């Protein structure tokens, strides 16, 4: 149908905008602490602690399959990156501190993304 196509164009354009959001958030992680999944070879107990692992590469795979239907789903995954890190790692660690800084800096980017998603519809 034509409606199905229109819907798919909307999803494509959201994917475009979320790709730019993802790039902006990932720049706030210049150490690349959140770039890849936590290695279960190197942290073999990780899944005993963290039930839903997340990282920027995994988000990018979902994004490119057009797997985010709305900004809420995308934000859910970004918050997992931060919150998983803040639980597994102690406050005095470079990992925890990196997550705080990513959360604080990403806030700005996500605030305007929400306005753009609503604005463009």
Region class of 86: left (phi > 0), else alpha (psi between -120 and 50), else beta: alpha
Residue 56's nearest CA partner among 85, 84, 77 is 77
Residue 55's nearest CA partner among 92, 85, 94, 98 is 85
Fold observed for domain 1-121? Histone Acetyltransferase; Chain A (1.20.920)
Look at the alpha carbons of 37, 98, 113, 52 in this order and tell me if their dihedral is positive or negative: positive
Structure-determination technique: X-ray
Residue 21's nearest CA partner among 85, 80, 108, 82 is 108
């Amino acid at each position: 149908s034509m409606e199905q196509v229109a819907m798919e164009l909307r999803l494509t354009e959201l994917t475009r905008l979320l790709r730019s959001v993802l790039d902006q958030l990932q720049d706030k992680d210049p150490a690349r602490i959140f770039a890849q999944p936590v290695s279960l070879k190197e942290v073999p107990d990780y899944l005993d602690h963290i039930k839903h692992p997340m990282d920027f590469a995994t988000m990018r795979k979902r994004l490119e399959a057009q797997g985010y239907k709305n900004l809420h789903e995308f934000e859910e995954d970004f918050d997992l990156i931060i919150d998983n890190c803040m639980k597994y790692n102690a406050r005095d660690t470079v990992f925890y501190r990196a997550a705080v800084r990513l959360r604080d800096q990403g806030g700005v980017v996500l605030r305007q993304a929400r306005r753009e998603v609503d604005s463009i519809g």
